[PDB]
Symmetry: T
Subunit: 140 residues, 12 copies
Amino acid sequence: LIVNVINGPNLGRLGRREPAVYGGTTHDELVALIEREAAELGLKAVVRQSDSEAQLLDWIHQAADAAEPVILNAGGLTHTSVALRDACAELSAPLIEVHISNVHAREEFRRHSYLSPIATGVIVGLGIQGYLLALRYLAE
Amino acid sequence: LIVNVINGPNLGRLGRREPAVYGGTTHDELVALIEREAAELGLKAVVRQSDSEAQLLDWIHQAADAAEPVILNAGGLTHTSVALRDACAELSAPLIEVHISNVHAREEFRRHSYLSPIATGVIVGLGIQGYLLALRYLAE
Amino acid sequence: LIVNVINGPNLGRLGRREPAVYGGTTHDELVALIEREAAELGLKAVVRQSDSEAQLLDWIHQAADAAEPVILNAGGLTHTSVALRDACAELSAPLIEVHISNVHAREEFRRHSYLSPIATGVIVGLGIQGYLLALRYLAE
Amino acid sequence: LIVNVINGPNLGRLGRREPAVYGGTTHDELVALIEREAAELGLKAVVRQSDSEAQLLDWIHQAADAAEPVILNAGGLTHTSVALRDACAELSAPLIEVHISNVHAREEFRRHSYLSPIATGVIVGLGIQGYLLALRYLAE
Amino acid sequence: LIVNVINGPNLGRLGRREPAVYGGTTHDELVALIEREAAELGLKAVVRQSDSEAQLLDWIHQAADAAEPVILNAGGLTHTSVALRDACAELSAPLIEVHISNVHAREEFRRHSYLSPIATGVIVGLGIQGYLLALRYLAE
Amino acid sequence: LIVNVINGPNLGRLGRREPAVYGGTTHDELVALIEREAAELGLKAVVRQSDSEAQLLDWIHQAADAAEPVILNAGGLTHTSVALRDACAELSAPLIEVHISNVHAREEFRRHSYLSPIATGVIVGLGIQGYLLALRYLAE
Amino acid sequence: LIVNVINGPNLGRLGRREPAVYGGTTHDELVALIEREAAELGLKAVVRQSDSEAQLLDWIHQAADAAEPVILNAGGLTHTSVALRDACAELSAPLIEVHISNVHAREEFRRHSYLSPIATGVIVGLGIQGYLLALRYLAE
Amino acid sequence: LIVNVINGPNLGRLGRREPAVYGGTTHDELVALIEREAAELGLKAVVRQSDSEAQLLDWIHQAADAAEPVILNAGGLTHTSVALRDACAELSAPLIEVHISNVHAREEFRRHSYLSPIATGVIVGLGIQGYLLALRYLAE
Amino acid sequence: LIVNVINGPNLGRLGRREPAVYGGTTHDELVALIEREAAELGLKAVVRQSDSEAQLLDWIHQAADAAEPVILNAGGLTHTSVALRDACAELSAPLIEVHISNVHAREEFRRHSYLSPIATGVIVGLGIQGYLLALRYLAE
Amino acid sequence: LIVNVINGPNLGRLGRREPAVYGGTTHDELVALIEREAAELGLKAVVRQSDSEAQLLDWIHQAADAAEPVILNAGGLTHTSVALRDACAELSAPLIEVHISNVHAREEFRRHSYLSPIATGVIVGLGIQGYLLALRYLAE
Amino acid sequence: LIVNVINGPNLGRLGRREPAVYGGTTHDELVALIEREAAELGLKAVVRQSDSEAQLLDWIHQAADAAEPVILNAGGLTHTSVALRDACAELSAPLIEVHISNVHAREEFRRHSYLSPIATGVIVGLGIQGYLLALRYLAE
Amino acid sequence: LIVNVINGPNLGRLGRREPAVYGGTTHDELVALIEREAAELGLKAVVRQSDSEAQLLDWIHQAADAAEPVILNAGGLTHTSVALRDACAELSAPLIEVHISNVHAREEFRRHSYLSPIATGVIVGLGIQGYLLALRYLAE
Ligand SMILES: C[C@H]1C(=O)[C@@H](O)[C@H](O)C[C@]1(O)C(=O)O
Ligand SMILES: C[C@H]1C(=O)[C@@H](O)[C@H](O)C[C@]1(O)C(=O)O
Ligand SMILES: C[C@H]1C(=O)[C@@H](O)[C@H](O)C[C@]1(O)C(=O)O
Ligand SMILES: C[C@H]1C(=O)[C@@H](O)[C@H](O)C[C@]1(O)C(=O)O
Ligand SMILES: C[C@H]1C(=O)[C@@H](O)[C@H](O)C[C@]1(O)C(=O)O
Ligand SMILES: C[C@H]1C(=O)[C@@H](O)[C@H](O)C[C@]1(O)C(=O)O
Ligand SMILES: C[C@H]1C(=O)[C@@H](O)[C@H](O)C[C@]1(O)C(=O)O
Ligand SMILES: C[C@H]1C(=O)[C@@H](O)[C@H](O)C[C@]1(O)C(=O)O
Ligand SMILES: C[C@H]1C(=O)[C@@H](O)[C@H](O)C[C@]1(O)C(=O)O
Ligand SMILES: C[C@H]1C(=O)[C@@H](O)[C@H](O)C[C@]1(O)C(=O)O
Ligand SMILES: C[C@H]1C(=O)[C@@H](O)[C@H](O)C[C@]1(O)C(=O)O
Ligand SMILES: C[C@H]1C(=O)[C@@H](O)[C@H](O)C[C@]1(O)C(=O)O
């Protein structure tokens, strides 16, 4: 019934920031899209974004405590943070990792994630629709 | 309007084969599910499966020639075949790579794909619904 | 009671092909030897050989379905095929990997197998008698 | 007097397929060019192409049995197949490996071949004329 | 006519020690089994065990001097000792390496041996029957 | 119309030096062969050899300035010199890398070149005829 | 006389979070245990916890300025943060690194720490008693 | 006309902290030096420092939005943060990376930066004068 | 009630041997310290030392048979011996690995242990008090 | 008072050579710029360039003997020459390494230098102004 | 005045053992040669050999205690034993490592020694005369 | 009867240059020492030194042609030059590699040589007496 969508560092900047890699849709538009899709799906989407690891960690804890599912695009922390991994590891509800870009078509260091192994599954390279697809999965 | 769904080695065996990793849905059921979802979406799905690399290659060529999109779960060849990669590289329409299992939660060699970099995007670990999500993306 | 002996690529060529590495016994002789040893042991040996991965995969599936044991010398695919590995992984009956040559005394890439980890056990460097020893194990 | 030219996966697609990397000459044209050059050189060229590993293996065996030289462009299998390597290893006549593209100017995985070490020699990046040069070598 | 069976560190402990990996057969039983199989085969088996590298080395020297074959399960020294390798390298008679466990299905460091390359051949994962099979090979 | 053939360190020694790897043809003979082939082809060949990196660099610069093609066998510097690579990178005309020996059949460090990636193409293992083939390519 | 105990990310969650790896003792209990042990030992323990790197860094600076010893369990930052390492490097008083879990029995990336080399020493796998042992060391 | 100087973790501690590696100049002195040099150069320098990644990210965003140049010494995050890299990647104005210490003369992990590749250029090992030199570049 | 303290190679030499790395306390003093601490704790400590792997192995076996806990400082064998690892793996009672020196602040090869993963926990860099702390843990 | 500026292989070619990577300023212009900046700074600049390693080595020796500072752009030898490193290691006066290009934004092999560790500091990617900045540092 | 010559595993076997790699001189002859050379040089040579690590360690300790120089050929333990390294590290007098064979011309694992770094120096590939040369050095 | 002693880059600088690593003996003294030792030994020593690779190569060729033995200290080229290796490979007479310093006790890149494998043997870390010992070997 409730899904948390959690966005990491530089996802606020989405919109203006390198549109050839990430698109012209802004973060607020993205929230709007998600919130609408959720309505259609009978879910409530709680979308949050922070460039702060500790803030992301808190949101994850809360979802762990609530046993609520999470959609997580952690940005660059995907490739770097064990701390994040360890928080997500406490989640009982499903975890879907999302990347807007096809990381596998970019720098070699982006081809590794600490999160993927403890994710339920992972969507990449489908743009912002990856979020929406991730929703729909959880709907089933 | 037309999508090719292409399944590689051991995907016929889907159903009976290690259900804790891959599920109880059989390949024919999977075709049935996909074909239905496509109808709902206004697409026609052409689903094919082969344990033969040369057969997969032929199907890919055909899609390249037709400029039709492809959903591809290549099984083990994902991690091994350059040949496959090179065929898919000729595709003008989108290519979505799908894995039923979360490969990132398994043997370390499964965490690399030759296909991912030339894919449009990639879905893993969402079971057979990954196919259906992949459809819906293409629908937009 | 029934054992499948399965031989991969270039094992037909056994006989004529580099005898200092692999010997002067031909494939038909090998079938003859195995079939005889099986009789002595009260087993029936079904020996097959193909240079085609898809054909090998089919034979493996069949053994999985029949819950029959397999002796497998996959040739070069031992070092390359995940697909093969994944088929063998479905086997409930024992799987013995056999190499005629001592791969550990040759090129460094031959010292890795995708099959060994899911094999019950592995015999190498004992020539064609490795097959016969593998039989006898299964006899117990 | 007789040379086998053997072309692997996706070489049929030569012509239409990424011409900036591989050119506008089609496979049939290539056969035509080779067959003509052979006439000028007093050789007979037998050019074959398959996307099937087992088919390539059979052609190689045949050349081994005939002690005929081979020109081999194995496509992607160059980087992946031990099986192929092992067949070519049986050749008594010379083996020239040919790549149309300069593999050393592309993805890092293309910079390794299993075939090069057992080749007599190797031509890359000279386009389809590499075949013709390979012929002429054998002519001496 | 005479075979040396040589067992390295922690093989005395065989029996009581992790039976899910190594079995319930004790070392004395193993000697008994081997000694019996040898009688059936017309051989005499000399089975020895030590947790001392220098003791193993002495036994190997003796076999080198006697030009007698050796069956060797060196335990953990398989993965660590060059010294052992160098002694075995002096053997003129055959050397069969045996492991009870399928090392290839365990920790990654067990997948390398210093002995395998100078072995005639290697049996692993067939339990204590690997010894008996190794005998029978030598019988031919 | 004009081609530069440029030979690096120890290519003077060609003739006397390890003939099983490099042949009995001497450097002067090689110049003679090339100069003749060029005449037949309507080209003029300027063949030079030096064991001095700075000398090779100067010859390369000159060819860059003249926009003349180069055939380059850099000897051991192929595997070691970035400096050389950087000079060749300035060439507008084609660059063919030639090795007499099949480097891929020798020490593992010879299997890498700094030059190959900026070469037009590369011939190896065809002996001194590799030079002549390289000429003929440039002729087209 | 005064010791700082510093706990990093997800150590608040200690208690509820994967108890098979980390235990049923909560963070407040841990503070209580430490504070008591300190009393027995004549020390004062200042225990702090934050999921914020910058907060941890500030606490470390303060201890550096005060020349007070630190017990530090940095959680996931142990494996990732150079920044943390650099702060701890300023400490004149001793630094004991503590992990509750035996990191060496878990994922391979946990087997490296940036902190260990600049630590005085390190305790792992002794649960929350590791803290108490670390205290007692400092007491001497 | 305006330059942002951005200093990461532990750069406040500059002054007191390991002076043999980093010097006796404090952060405030550094601001003073920079601010003065800027006046001489006709620029305005905005120097900021934070041990918080999210704070650094915000400052970078702001500079991206303002199309203002940045001088960045990210401290330890240089070696660890992709997130930072991704923010800096949005900068249209130049980016100069500065390290006070010669990182190449220290621990091996310091010899890699995620920032260097997207920097315009990089100064290291020139102490705090590196900042001043970086200014002067931007002045041209 | 009974603890085995087991010391490997060169721990007799403790005292005289490089005191800047290991201290001025001799092995006999160490036994004395441990034996006293044990009395205070109500335990009996059996401390043994050998430079012989086979001797250490025997002591470990004995503890396995007795289901007695072990404190083990294996010296250099920590980094080299699988054999030792395999013996310790049979222990049902706890195993604490102790190093006097902070191995993580020394040569890179010391930063790996074969024992750590099968240890209950590990203390390093706390000098000879590490033994005493290890005792006290076992006391609880 | 006197500074040596030392330029390695292919730096003469600066000007004409790939201007998108290195610029349109020629070497003589560069000398002119440096010589002028030195005058302004009260220094005398001795700028030399050679494609010969032995020549560079001689210039370095001379500076070592004179205890004069050096600015060194060694070109490709930066990544390859230990010999150069060893000469520079004899310098008592400061050594500044300069690269015109941002090597960290190019081929992966350019991201390592043998010189950086024994340099005082290093400037890269600031074009030919890097030389001038390097001067000014030495002026202080 | 006194030198210890210490020989490790399989050096007794010297003489009979692979003479193409190690020669026809036996160990007793070697002692005889050394003892004679020592007389000529005014030294006394104490030559010992053991296949036992603990025995070698004891001899090393004794030399450390006596502050006597050591010539050490440790055989295979050179590549494997940290324990040995640690004993030799206690030596105040010089340590010369000797290998009869040129290890650098053999298996790749022989090209590393744990002893070389703490040796004064190392002689390899000069046969048994390496011992004699090592003596003479110590004589000065 | 005649030996060539060949010294590479920076060996002229021997004497003045880092004496803690290389000593206070100058190159001329070294020639003097060698020339004297040769007289005592009945040999004639031809000692040459160059910082030029091409010059060293010429001297090596000459020795190959003369079938004269060589003592070679190539300095930094030891670790970098294949070209040198290839020249030395032509030598029929023995080749002794000498390093003054114990390279194995220094930077990790010094622990590899291209020359060692084709050397007869190698002396390191015995200072300039290594030359003299190398002479004496050749004397036998
Ligand atoms: C948001 C994106 C990033 O910030 C990148 O660091 C990451 O590699 C890919 C990313 O997570 C994305 O494609 O959504
Ligand atoms: C079908 C699956 C396989 O066959 C595996 O080889 C592969 O690693 C994962 C897989 O593609 C899947 O999860 O769908
Ligand atoms: C049959 C053999 C091969 O084809 C090789 O590729 C393989 O490395 C070893 C082999 O499986 C064998 O030794 O039987
Ligand atoms: C035919 C080409 C391929 O298919 C690629 O896979 C291969 O890397 C290069 C190739 O063999 C070629 O350049 O001819
Ligand atoms: C006896 C076993 C061991 O001691 C392990 O160290 C080794 O990895 C495997 C072993 O040799 C066996 O499976 O027999
Ligand atoms: C001339 C040859 C050499 O000098 C070797 O160093 C090189 O690896 C191969 C070579 O370039 C050749 O085969 O022509
Ligand atoms: C607190 C734990 C963690 O958060 C993990 O990331 C770390 O690998 C181990 C840990 O520090 C612990 O075992 O206390
Ligand atoms: C400020 C310094 C650091 O904090 C270190 O982590 C870094 O490796 C180097 C540094 O950025 C510096 O030399 O200025
Ligand atoms: C006793 C020490 C050694 O012998 C070293 O080999 C080892 O690396 C560390 C050691 O175990 C210790 O610090 O106690
Ligand atoms: C002069 C340039 C080169 O020659 C390149 O080899 C080197 O990688 C970078 C260079 O030193 C430069 O950017 O100045
Ligand atoms: C005695 C020899 C050996 O035992 C080998 O293990 C070693 O690699 C080389 C050796 O030390 C030697 O060449 O003397
Ligand atoms: C002469 C020395 C050098 O120049 C170093 O480059 C080399 O690593 C060691 C050296 O060859 C020596 O120790 O004689």
